């Protein structure tokens, strides 16, 4: 009982500090600047060929090669401009809920409810793509995989844990624990020294890869968090949940800043991504449409409605030229 | 640059040929999601037609069922993955009345799930012999766990197995109708629950799954050709 009382007192102190720092709201300060207005975006190319629903996509460091993972057991690597499949890796397990494309471009990753992160080497002398490594040790499904470099990889699991792996040795270099619900998504900072993970306990968490301890913890949603991704500057991140809302957190402010929602939307959110400037929050919804929110006004600036099912994948290029939406109708579209 | 574009072209041609072959393979295979709980014979069902994967073949049609048991108790996230499946095979132990209510809650949630309201559920009320022994013993009464059973009568359309105690038939069909009530409360006709009385020693569950999926696909084909 004393421990519970101390925890409640610490939480009360945290709320008091957050309220004290909350001198003004984001919307009031940002009301001075002009909104971007309605955003018109159309399907330039429809990358089709996937046989089933797509769960993850990731743009390469080169803004042309993208990689998309679908439960028909495929990891297809496309050339965005020419709509050409550069590669088509068959997967051991059909249900891949995540995929990554290494910054060097030499490797890709898959993971899902098989509980193994399979890393495939692309730039191989012997022609076809081969399975480079397999990372086992997560006792829950894997929902997000991100590459720090050719050897360091962060994988979040449904067992309320994250893990930094050294790819060469294949064993968990570091394990991040402290979530009380399934971790559904993660993102790496542009500096790649910190990373935030959102879980099913309506909680996001800033972790330091070197230390291995939870640097910060953010709350504010009402239900499971499905998506998370840093602001381009690395000092903020937006999270979408099943209660049809986005919320933006700043790491230094240590609380929520703006809430994106409307009465007419009740479906949850499934994927969130940022543009280069961070002006636009692209969020995938279960109502078959993507929405683009203004980070400063929190008013929908446009709807990407071209999918016959829920959107599960949002990818924004490193150079910001194109975005790609992957849906459960086995279609991946690019909206330039 | 032209040589690179041409090379990319035959690479695309080869990969598209591979994906056409793989689509032909994929559309001919049906995925089934195996669900249940402890003391429910999911493993016995899996082994009786000969883990994370189970491969079986009926009438030269390949079904793939998946006992997702490597995760935690929470199901709301990884159950969203199984909506392209043709069916959800829900195996429940009808003997345990305790954890029967949890099973009804699970079935209700699966039936009313947004991403499972199109996927029909094949309901396997397993361990019918255990239920028969429990009701014949009489030490544990179903009325304690379900007072409605005290005012339930066997429906006239029931087809009990010959030489069965009518109390056993009443209990079996009572639990079956309890599941079917949730089935028909919000079915809307897009998906239907197909109850079956299965035991551990039976050897025709694969045929039931096959016929059930054939019925599902027949209904889907009538739907797409707008017959009904």
């Amino acid at each position, epitope marked *: 009982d004393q421990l519970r009382q101390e925890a409640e007192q610490l*939480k009360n102190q945290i709320r008091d500090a957050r309220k004290a720092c909350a001198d003004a709201t984001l919307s009031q300060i940002t009301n001075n600047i002009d909104p971007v207005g309605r955003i018109q975006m159309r399907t330039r190319r429809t990358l089709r060929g996937h046989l089933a629903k797509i769960y993850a996509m990731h743009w390469g460091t080169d803004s042309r090669l993208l990689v998309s993972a679908s439960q028909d057991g495929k990891l297809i690597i496309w050339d965005s401009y020419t709509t050409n499949k550069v590669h088509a890796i068959p997967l051991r397990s059909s249900w891949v809920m995540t995929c990554a494309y290494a910054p060097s471009g030499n490797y890709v990753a898959c993971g899902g409810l098989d509980n193994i992160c399979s890393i495939y080497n692309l730039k191989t002398r012997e022609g076809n793509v081969r399975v480079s490594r397999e990372l086992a040790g997560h006792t829950g499904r894997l929902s997000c995989c991100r590459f720090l470099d050719d050897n360091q990889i962060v994988t979040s699991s449904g067992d309320t844990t994250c893990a930094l792996w050294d790819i060469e040795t294949g064993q968990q270099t570091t394990t991040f624990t402290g979530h*009380t*619900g399934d971790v559904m998504s993660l993102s790496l900072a542009p500096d790649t020294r910190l990373f935030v993970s959102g879980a*099913c*306990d*309506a*909680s996001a968490k800033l972790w330091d890869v070197r230390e291995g301890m939870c640097r910060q913890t953010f*709350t*504010g949603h*009402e*239900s*499971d968090i499905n998506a998370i991704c840093f602001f381009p500057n690395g000092n903020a991140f937006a999270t979408g949940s*099943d*209660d*049809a809302t986005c919320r933006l957190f700043d790491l230094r402010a240590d609380q929520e800043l703006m809430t994106y929602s409307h009465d007419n939307i*009740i479906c*949850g959110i499934t994927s969130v991504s940022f543009s280069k400037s961070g002006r636009l929050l692209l969020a995938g919804y279960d109502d078959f449409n993507c929405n683009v929110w203004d980070a400063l006004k929190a008013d929908r600036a446009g709807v990407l409605a071209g999918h016959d099912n829920r959107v599960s994948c949002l990818g924004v290029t490193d150079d910001g030229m194109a975005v790609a939406t992957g849906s459960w109708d086995s279609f991946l579209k690019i909206w330039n | 640059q032209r040589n690179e574009e041409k090379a990319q072209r035959e690479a695309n041609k080869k990969i598209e040929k591979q994906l056409q072959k793989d689509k032909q393979v994929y559309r001919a295979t049906h995925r089934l999601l195996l669900l249940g709980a402890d003391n429910s014979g999911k493993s016995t069902i899996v082994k009786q037609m000969r883990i994370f994967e189970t491969k079986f073949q009926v009438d030269k049609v390949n079904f793939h069922m998946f006992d997702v048991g490597g995760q*935690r*108790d*929470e*199901r*709301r996230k990884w159950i969203q993955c199984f909506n392209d499946v043709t069916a959800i095979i829900f195996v429940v132990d009808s003997s345990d009345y*305790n954890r029967l*209510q*949890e099973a009804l*809650n*699970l079935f*209700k*949630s*699966i*039936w*009313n*799930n*947004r991403w499972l309201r199109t996927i029909s559920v094949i309901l396997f009320l397993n361990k019918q012999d255990l239920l028969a022994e429990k009701v014949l013993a009489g030490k544990s009464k179903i009325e*304690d*766990y*379900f*007072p*409605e059973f005290a005012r339930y009568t066997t429906p006239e359309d029931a087809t009990p197995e010959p030489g069965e105690d009518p109390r056993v038939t009443r209990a079996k069909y009572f639990i079956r109708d309890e599941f079917l009530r949730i089935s028909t409360a*919000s079915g809307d006709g897009r998906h239907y629950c197909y109850p079956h009385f299965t035991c551990a020693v039976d050897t025709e569950n694969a045929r039931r799954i096959f016929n059930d999926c054939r019925d599902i696909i027949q209904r889907m084909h009538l739907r797409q050709y707008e017959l009904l």
Partner: nanobody
Amino acid sequence: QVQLQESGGGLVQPGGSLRLSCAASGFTFSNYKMNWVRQAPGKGLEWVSDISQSGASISYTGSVKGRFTISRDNAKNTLYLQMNSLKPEDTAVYYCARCPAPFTRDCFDVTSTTYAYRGQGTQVTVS
């Protein structure tokens, strides 16, 4: 953060009565199906009762049907379970749980180890 603080419970002789209330904070109370789940010593979680978004759809576990009544106060953001004619098997830790998704008739909230949106619970001893 989501909070579900339960009040009530205690020692009651068999055949007695109690009113377990629980106040919920951190979300829109009307959007979530509310449940009462009890855990007796020596056994796992057991779903007792549930009430829907508008209170029109009400269901109970068969063992506690008739005796126990569910109710939901939207204005007070709280959930009440009234227990009457108690039995020795009713001693347990009682939790009020949200179904994880709003505007949904489906939920998975009897998790054995940890469920994120479950209250701290109150001890109800019937002896």
